[PDB]
């Protein structure tokens, strides 16, 4: 339960802006779509605005808005993300690709007018020139993951840990370990959650009419991991 939660009861337009630098290779991406947190549903289309994207599209999916998560009614007291709105939250991550380089990201997620905007800076370093990432050896698809969340009372926000599994063309899988910290931008009260996780499913696709290097994303996110109705057992 939060005031910010009222801002997500209907369909919300989304804008995404990223500037990246991976091993010196500079690039930019813009994205647009909408989210409907009532169903945990996101629809987004991203375009590289600087030509060809120097990394595989799947590597950027987690970087490109967990405030659109569906939290069940019995878990609404644990939804930090919406509680930070509309002033929003800073989302910082380190993403370590196993046996390869790493991304470091800082993003601000906040309303600008009626639009929920995610603005990202990304720096990647230590990547291998013909590794799975710079070598473009990832399949163009995405797996389902859990995002494990705990309160970070010290910073009045939350932290998350999870491991992305990227399918590799040769049949192997490339692990991307994610460490995440979110903190509110404003200083209104926020909700600090008990341990729980976000169960996420994502489908990648292409716009048959699109000439630019691009990604179409359909995502469903649902909060879980806190049991319903426990109290009644002891009555």
């Amino acid at each position: 339960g939060s005031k910010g939660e009222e801002l997500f009861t209907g369909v919300v337009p989304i804008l995404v802006e990223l500037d990246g630098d991976v091993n010196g290779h500079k690039f930019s991406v813009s994205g647009e779509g909408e989210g409907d947190a009532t169903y945990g549903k996101l629809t987004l289309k991203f375009i590289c605005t600087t030509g060809k994207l120097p990394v595989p599209w799947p590597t950027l999916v987690t970087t490109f808005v967990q405030c659109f998560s569906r939290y069940p009614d019995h878990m609404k007291r644990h939804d930090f993300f919406k509680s930070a709105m509309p002033e929003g939250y800073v989302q910082e991550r380190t993403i370590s690709f196993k046996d390869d380089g790493n991304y470091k990201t800082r993003a601000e997620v906040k309303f600008e007018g009626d639009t929920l905007v995610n603005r990202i800076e990304l720096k990647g370093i230590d990547f291998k020139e013909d590794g799975n990432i710079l070598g473009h050896k990832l399949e163009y698809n995405y797996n389902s993951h859990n995002v494990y969340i705990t309160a970070d009372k010290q910073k009045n926000g939350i932290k998350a840990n999870f491991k992305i599994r990227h399918n590799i063309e040769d049949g192997s899988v490339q692990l991307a370990d994610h460490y995440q910290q979110n903190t509110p931008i404003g200083d209104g009260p926020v909700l600090l959650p008990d341990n729980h996780y976000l169960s996420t499913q994502s489908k990648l696709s292409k716009d048959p009419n699109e000439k630019r290097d691009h990604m179409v994303l359909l995502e469903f996110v649902t909060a879980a991991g806190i049991t319903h109705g426990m109290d009644e057992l002891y009555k």
Binding site: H136, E169, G171
Partner: protein, 99 residues
Amino acid sequence: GSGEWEIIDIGPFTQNLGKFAVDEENKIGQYGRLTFNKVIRPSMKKTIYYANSRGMIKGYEYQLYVYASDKLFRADISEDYQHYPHRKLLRFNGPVPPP
């Protein structure tokens, strides 16, 4: 690997695949400058999969009969979602006899 060839219709999207083939062929120059006329039936398509045990969809391949500069050619095009730009001209030759 790949799936089986199946017939597809020759609407505007298939016509645009034929225009793509002629544009690509014109870059290579083997047949001089060609002017797209039309894609005719039969048009064929098959699915391309990643060559591993998951066998997920990687893209598609097309076989077309394309008239350009009033001569009939056979063009093969691949669409590969892993690598940009996604469409590649694989084959363009003729003239060939009508199907």
